[PDB]
Amino acid sequence: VQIVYKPVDLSKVTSKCGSLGNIHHKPGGGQVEVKSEKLDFKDRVQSKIGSLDNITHVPGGGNKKIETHKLTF
Amino acid sequence: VQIVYKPVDLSKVTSKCGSLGNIHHKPGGGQVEVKSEKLDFKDRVQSKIGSLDNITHVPGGGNKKIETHKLTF
Amino acid sequence: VQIVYKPVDLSKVTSKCGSLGNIHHKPGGGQVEVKSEKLDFKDRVQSKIGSLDNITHVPGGGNKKIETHKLTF
Amino acid sequence: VQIVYKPVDLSKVTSKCGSLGNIHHKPGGGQVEVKSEKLDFKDRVQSKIGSLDNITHVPGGGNKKIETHKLTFR
Amino acid sequence: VQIVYKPVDLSKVTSKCGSLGNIHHKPGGGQVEVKSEKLDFKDRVQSKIGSLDNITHVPGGGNKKIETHKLTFR
Amino acid sequence: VQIVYKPVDLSKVTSKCGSLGNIHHKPGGGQVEVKSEKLDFKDRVQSKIGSLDNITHVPGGGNKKIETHKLTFR
Fold this sequence. Notes:
homohexamer; 9 strands; protein fibril; Amyloid; tau; hexameric
């Protein structure tokens, strides 16, 4: 009796996620102007005037790999 | 009696996800103007005036790989 | 009696999802103007004036691969 | 036997090409106003305002003269 | 036997190409105003305002003269 | 036997290419005003304001003269 147990694993499991390999070439507005006598911002206000924002959240992208290798004679 | 147990795995499991490989070439408006006597923002206001926003969320993109390799004689 | 158990897996499982491989070439409006005496925003208001927004959400794009390889003599 | 090969060439070949012998008297006098606001250009601009450039390109005007003289006796 | 081979060449071949012999008298007198505000250019600009440059390119104007003389006796 | 090979060449080949013999009298007198504010340029700018440059490029104007003389007797 002989048993030759030689399984081969060359697998790959990959996450490529979020913001990858992008090109942002010369972004922006020409002119932005805001004229007022008052600006009054007073509860949970977000104001963006002429800004550039690159924002990435990756709570995902996790990998789980499980193997079992059982030989019973 | 002989058993040769040599399964081969060369597989790939991949998550290319979110914002990948894009080109943003010279973005933005020419002129933006806001004229007022008051701007008055006062509960959960989001204001964007001439801004550029690139925003990416990836809660997804997860990989699960499970193998079992069982030999009972 | 002999058994040669040699399955080969060369498979590909891929998710390509969200915003991939796009070209955004010279985007934007020429002129944007807002004229008022008041802008008055006061509960859960979103205002966009001349902004460019690229927004990507990927809660999906997950992969599951399951294998079992069972030999009983 | 006498031979007298005496051709005379007084010819002239001339090219007069382009802007020759012109008079431009007080050119571009008077008044040019460009008042410009809130413009966007997404592509190439060529602009001239009140210009009086003199621009000359001469890729041509080349001359070729070929003169073969042969005399054969017997 | 007498042979006289006495061709006479007083010819002329001439090129007059481009901007020759012009008179420009008080060019660009008077008044140029450019008033410009809040402009965006996303691409190449060439601009001339009140310019009077003299620009000359001559890739041409080349001369080739080829004289061959051969006399063969017997 | 007499042969008298006496060709005469007083001919001329001439090139006059580009900007020759021009008069420019008081060019660019008078007034140029450029007033500019709040401009954006995302690419290459060539600009000339009130310029009177003299610019000459001559890749050409080359001269080639070939004079072959051969006399063969018997």
